[PDB]
Assembly symmetry: D2
C-alpha cells in the first residue's frame, strides 16, 4: 500500500534553491579531512561522502566563502557524529555520562577545555576546530549566541536521554531542540557573515521564525522517514504518535502532518507581520537572517530527497507523484 | 528649515535590488526609438535619457530577456507620455475628450482600433506596438488581465478629470489607480514570463499584495516630492491633506506618511499569511508574482533616488534623512 | 614516485564553472541509468560516485536542466558502450565490433528498430539521446553529430584490429578512441552553439578540437599509478622504451607535450579568420567548449578519485 | 565621399558579450556626485559628466571589483579625464615647463614629498591623492611601484606631446611614431594598473615583464587608438582636425577615405593576430600564477572592449545615433 504524502515543496519551500558554488571544493577538502580525523576506512569514508552533508551546508549559506563553507561542513560532520552518541551510542541510556559529555563540550567554548587532538578525542577535536574559527571572526555577542543556541540543542538531548532510560506539543518541543536547527542557524550566521543585533534577534517574531524552521525540518523528516521507520519497526516518531493518539490510519496521520506543515507557513508570515522595522541598515541583515531560517528548512528538504536519506535513490518519485509506497 | 523624512528603505524595501543585466542594451535601443517616434529634439531626448525609465523597468523584471525589456521600456515611455495628457495636458479639464481618449486607447487591445503610425498618433502607436508584442507571447487569459488592469488605471484617470473640472482614503483610492502600478505589474508578468492562473491571481491575498505595491509607490512619491511641491505651490498632495485635516506640522505629517508606509509592510505579511498553497508548481510562480509586486515598489524607490527625480543631491536625504526646504 | 607535471596551467588554470543544474540532473539521470541497466545497489552506488554528471556540468555550464540530463544519459552511454570494446565482448572480435558500430550508426536517422531498455539497454540510451538531439538541432548540426560519432566508432574498429591482429600513431588512436570529438558535439547541443559548418571545418577550429583531445589523452596517461595493474599499452611505456628514459624523465616529456598543446592552441587561434561579429560571437563560444571539455575531464578526473582515490597529488604534485 | 564603410570593430576577441560590474549603479551614484562636489561642477556640467558615464567604462574593465574599489576606479577615471585635458587643450598644452612641473608634483603624490591636498587647494591633485591612498592601502610594494611606473609611462608621453606642440614641426607621417605616441598618451597602461587593483589581480613582476604580456598591453592600447580613430572620423571632419590616422594614411599612400579606413581595419585584425601569437610564446608559471595571468590577459581585452562599447553607448563620437553605424557599418560624412 501507500500514503498520499503532503506536498512539502509549497509556499516558502517552492522557490528554486540556491547552492553554494564552493560546494565541490569544500566537499573535497572536508570529506577527506573528517575521514583522516575519524579514521574512516575506504568504505566508511565513501558512505559518509554519499551522505553529502556538504550539499546541506551549501544551501544554508550559499555565498559563504570556501573556507567558511569547509568549517560548516566540519560542523555538520561533528553534529552527526556527536548526536549519534545520544540517539544510538554509548550515551543513549546514561543520563549521568550524557550530562558530562554536554558539560565537557560546552567547556570547549571559552571554558576550561584542554587542547584536543584527533588522537585524544576526535569528535571534541572537530568541535574545537570549529569553535576556534568561529571565535576568530565573530564578535563576543555572536560568540555568546552560538554558545546559547548549542545549549538549546544540548538541553533537549539531555531531556531525550532521561526519557529513553526513565503528546504532540511535548514531542515538537523536544524535537525543536534535538533536531539541531538552532545551532545550524548560528552556524549559518557565521557562514553568511550575518550579525543581527541581539535585541532584534530576541524579538518574538525572529524567535518564531527559528521555531518554524525547526518545526519544518522535524515534520519533513517525520514524513520521509515513515517507510524506513515502518521497515525497522520504530516507535518514537510523529506518525506513530498521531496514529496511536486517536487510532488514526497512516493516511489520516500523514494528513495531520500536512496541516502542521501548512500551519508553519501561516505562523511564519504572522510572525513577520509583527516584526517592526529597525531602519534600513539593521533590516537588511534581518531579511538575510529570515532567509537563513528558510534556507535551513529548504536545505534539509532538498538534501533529504537528493541523497536518498530516507527513500533511497528512487525517492524522487515520491516528490513527483506524492505517493510513498510501503 | 527641513523635515526629517521617515526611512523608506525598511523591511521588504531593505534588500539589495537586483537589476536586469540587459539594462544597457535595452536602453541603447529604446531611448533613441522613442526620441524618433516622438520627434524629441536633441535636448529633450537627452533629458528623457536622464530620466532613465529603463532603470525602473530593469528592476521590475530583472530576468526579462532583452527584447521583452525593450517592450517594457517602450511601455514606460508610453505611460509617462499618456499620463501627462490627463495630469497637465490637453485632457486635464476635458471630460468628454478624456473619455474618448480612453475609449480609443482601449480599442487598441483587440477592439476596433485602426492601425496607428508614428505620424498619425505617436502615443497610441507606442501603445499599439506594445500590445502587439504582448499578445504574441501571452495566453488569452493573460491578455485579458493586461486589459483589465489597464482599465483600473484608465478609470481613475477619468475620475481625476471629473475632479479637475469639478479624505485620505479617497485620496489613496484615486492614486492607487492613477499611479499606474496595476498595469505595471501586468507588464512585469509579461517581462518575467510569469503566468499565475486567474483563480489564484484573484485571491484576495494577491490582490492585497498589488494594493500594497501601489500604496508604497504613492506614499514614497508623496514624501519625496514635498520639497518640489512646496517650491511650486502644489496643494493637492498627501502632506497638505494631512496637515490640513489634523492640524499638523510638516514634520508631524511626514511622520504619519512613514507610519502608513510601515503599515503597508504589516498588511503585506498579513495578506501572505492568508495566501493558500496551490502545490509546488503553481506556488513557484506565485512567489515570483509576489516578488514582482515588491520589485515594482522597490524599483520606484531606487529609481526616484538614482535619477534625482524629486531631489536632484537627493542621495544625501537617503543617508541623513534630512530634506532641506 | 614521480613528480607529475602541473596539469592546471595556461588555459586550464581558470576557475571552473559548473552547471547549477548539476544536482537536479544527477538526481534524475543516475537513478534512470541504474534502472535501465538493472544495476544492483552496489553497482549503482559505484556509478553515482563515478559522477559523470560533474563532467557534463563543466562541458556545458549553462545548458538547461533537460539538456544536461541528456548529456548525462550520453555520458553513461559512452561509458557502457566503450567498455564493450576495451574489455567486454567486442575486445577481440572484429566481425562483431563492426556489426555493433553498424547498428549504432543506424540509430542516427537510419533503419534501426525502436529499441527498449529490455531489448538492448545500451542501444536504447543512445537512441533516447539521438531523439532529443534531433528534436532541437538543425539538419546541419545533426550531420555533424553523426560524423563526429563516426570518427569515434572508426578508431574503435582500428583498436579491435590491433587486438586480434610511434607516439604519433599512439596519439592518433587515442584522439579517436577517447571520445573528445563526440563530446564536443554533445556540448554544442548542451550549450545551444551552432557554428556554421564552413567555419567549423576551418583548420584552426579543427586544431582546437585536436588540442582538446590531446589534452584529455595526455592527462589520462599521466594520472593512470593504476597502470599496479601490470598494463603496458600506454604513453609512459612508449617513451621509456623509445628514448631510454626513467619514469621521471618520461613524465617530464609528457608535461612538455601538455605545454605544447597550449602553444598549438594559440597558434591555431592566430590563424582563425574573422567572419564578422555575429558569427565570431558563437565561434568564441565554440572555442570555450573545446577548452571546457578538456578542463572538465581534468577536474572530474581529480574530483572523483577516478585515477588516484588525488586532491593531494593536485596540491603537491604521485 | 558622402560615406565610408567602416570595418567591423566587434570581431574576434571583441565579439563576446561584455560583462558589466553589477555595482555600476551604486558606484555611479557615489562617484558622479562626489566629483561634481570636488570640482564645483554646476548643474549642467555635472549632468554632462554623468552622461559621459565613465562608470560604465570602469565597470567593464573590472566587472567583479567590489563597490568600494569600483568607486575608486570611477574616481581615477574622472581624475585622468580632467588631468589629461590640461595637456591636450588646457593651460599645459603649450607650456613644457609648467607641464613638467605638473608631472613632477603629481608623481610626488605617489609616496614622494607632496603635501596633503584638499579639494579646495588643488582638486585634480586631490583626487589622484585619494586614489593613491586607497591603491597603496591594499597593494604590495611591487604593485605600488608598477602603478607608479605605468603612470610615469603616460606622463612621459604627455611631456613628449607638449614638446612637439611648441616645437611646431609637421604632423608625423610615420605610422609607427603616430601609434607609439598615442599608445602612451591614451592612458591604457595606467588603466590596466587600475584594473589590476579593481580586480585584485597580482601577476608577479617577472611574469608581467615577459614580452608576451607587454605585447598584450600594447595590443590593448593599439585597439583603443584604432577604434578611436575610426569612430572619430566624422567629428574630426566636422571640426577640421587633420592630425589623425585617417589623414596620415591618406597622405602617405595617396588613398581615398575608404581605402584608408580599410587599412585601419587591417590594423585592427592584425592586433588580434599579434595577441594570439604573443600568447603562444607566453610560458606557463604553474597554476597559481597562470590563474592570475589569465585574469590579467582578460583585463587587457576588457580595457579595449570596454572602450568600444562605452564609446557607442555614450555617443562619445557619433551621438545617440552612432549605434546605427555599428548596425550597418555605414558612417555618413558632413
Amino acid at each position: 500500500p501507500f500514503v498520499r504524502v503532503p506536498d512539502l515543496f509549497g509556499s516558502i519551500m517552492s522557490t528554486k534553491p540556491v547552492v553554494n558554488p564552493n560546494y565541490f571544493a569544500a566537499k573535497a577538502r572536508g570529506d577527506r579531512w573528517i575521514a583522516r580525523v575519524m579514521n574512516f576506512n575506504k568504505a566508511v569514508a565513501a558512505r559518509n561522502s554519499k551522505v553529502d552533508l556538504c550539499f546541506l551546508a551549501s544551501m544554508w549559506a550559499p555565498d559563504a566563502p570556501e573556507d567558511r563553507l569547509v568549517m560548516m561542513l566540519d560542523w555538520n560532520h561533528w553534529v552527526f557524529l556527536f548526536d549519534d552518541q545520544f540517539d544510538e551510542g554509548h550515551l543513549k541510556e546514561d543520563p549521568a555520562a550524557a550530562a558530562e559529555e554536554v558539560k565537557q563540550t560546552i567547556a570547549i567554548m571559552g571554558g576550561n577545555a584542554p587542547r584536543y587532538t584527533a588522537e585524544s578525542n576526535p569528535i571534541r577535536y572537530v568541535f574545537q576546530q570549529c569553535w576556534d574559527r568561529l571565535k576568530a571572526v565573530s564578535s563576543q555577542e555572536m560568540q555568546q549566541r552560538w554558545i546559547d543556541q548549542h545549549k538549546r540543542y544540548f538541553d533537549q538531548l539531555l531531556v531525550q536521554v532521561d526519557q529513553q532510560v526513565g503528546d504532540v506539543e511535548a514531542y515538537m518541543d523536544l524535537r525543536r531542540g534535538t533536531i539541531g536547527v538552532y545551532p545550524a542557524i548560528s552556524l549559518s550566521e557565521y557562514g553568511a557573515g550575518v550579525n543581527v543585533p541581539q535585541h532584534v534577534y530576541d524579538h518574538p517574531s525572529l524567535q518564531e521564525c527559528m521555531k518554524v524552521s525547526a518545526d519544518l525540518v522535524t515534520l519533513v523528516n517525520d514524513v520521509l522517514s515513515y517507510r524506513k521507520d515502518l521497515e525497522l519497526g520504530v516507535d518514537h516518531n510523529l506518525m506513530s504518535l498521531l496514529m496511536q493518539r486517536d487510532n488514526l490510519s497512516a493516511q489520516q496521520a500523514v494528513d495531520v502532518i500536512g496541516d502542521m506543515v501548512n500551519e508553519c507557513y501561516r505562523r511564519w508570515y504572522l510572525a513577520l507581520a509583527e516584526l517592526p522595522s529597525y531602519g534600513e541598515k539593521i533590516d537588511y541583515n534581518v531579511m538575510k537572517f529570515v532567509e537563513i531560517c528558510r534556507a535551513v528548512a529548504q536545505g534539509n528538504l532538498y538534501w533529504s530527497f537528493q541523497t536518498g536519506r530516507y527513500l533511497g535513490p528512487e525517492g524522487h518519485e515520491v516528490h513527483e507523484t506524492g505517493i510513498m509506497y510501503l
